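ARCHIVE CARD
Drawer: 12
Card no.: 0347
Subject: one protein chain, sequence and derived structure
Cross-reference: see card 0346
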Amino acid sequence: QCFLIDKNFVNKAVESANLTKDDVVLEIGLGKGILTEELAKNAKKVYVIEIDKSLEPYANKLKELYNNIEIIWGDALKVDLNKLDFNKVVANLPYQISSPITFKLIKRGFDLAVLMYQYEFAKRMVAAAGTKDYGRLSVAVQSRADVEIVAKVPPSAFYPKPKVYSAIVKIKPNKGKYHIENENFFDDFLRAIFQHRNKSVRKALIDSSKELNYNKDEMKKILEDFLNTNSEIKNLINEKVFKLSVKDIVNLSNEFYRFLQNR
C-alpha cells in the first residue's frame, strides 16, 4: 500500500476540488489521514471508505479533532454509493480499482472529482482523438465528463515508493455535452469498435458483430443500409476507429441505435 505522504500533492488535489463548507466529499481510502484532514477542514463532511481496519488509529485520532468525518469500513466497489449524500470525490485511489471505481462513480453522479491514478491510465483517460493513447477508456470517460491532468505526481510523493508516476486527474461530469441514446448499447458499441482500433469502424463492427448480437453477414448488410441514410454516416464509418472524435463516436452510436431500433 503506497500512501500519499507529500502534503504538497494533497494541497494540489484539494485546491483543484474547489471545496466549500456546502460540499460533501467522498474519499476512497484513509491512508495516513493527511488528505482526510484537509477534506474535513474545508468541506461540510467527509465520508471515508476504507478496507483496512488496522488503520483505525488514524481515524480515531482525526475524530478527536474533527466532528465531520464518517468512516465506512468496507470495499469501495461493494458499498452502495446511492445511499451516501456526497457531491464531490477526492482520493488517492487504490490503482487496481481504477477503472471500475471511475465508472461506478460517474454512474452514481457527482459535481466534481479529483482523483489520483497511475500516470499511464491518466494519459489514456485524457488522450485526444487520433493520438497513440486514445482508446476505449478515453471515449468512455470523455463522452460523460470533462477531464484533465492537474499534475504529475512523482514516486517520491508516496511511501513505499511506487514503480511509476501517478497523476492527479480532475473529472467534471457533463451529461448535456454528448447525450447518449442508450447506455447499454453505447457500451456495447464502444467495446466492439475498440476491439479493432486501427480498422475502419465499418470493418471493426463486422469483425465484432457478435458483441452487438448480429452475425457477420447480417452486420455487413445492416451497414450497407445504414450507410445509405446520409453522407455523414458513410464518411464516419469508413474512417479508422481511433481517428473519430468523441463527439462523432457518440453521434454515430446514437444514429446506429435508432437505425437498429427500427428492427
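Annotation on reverse: The radius of gyration is 21 Å. The first strand starts at residue 3 and ends at 4.
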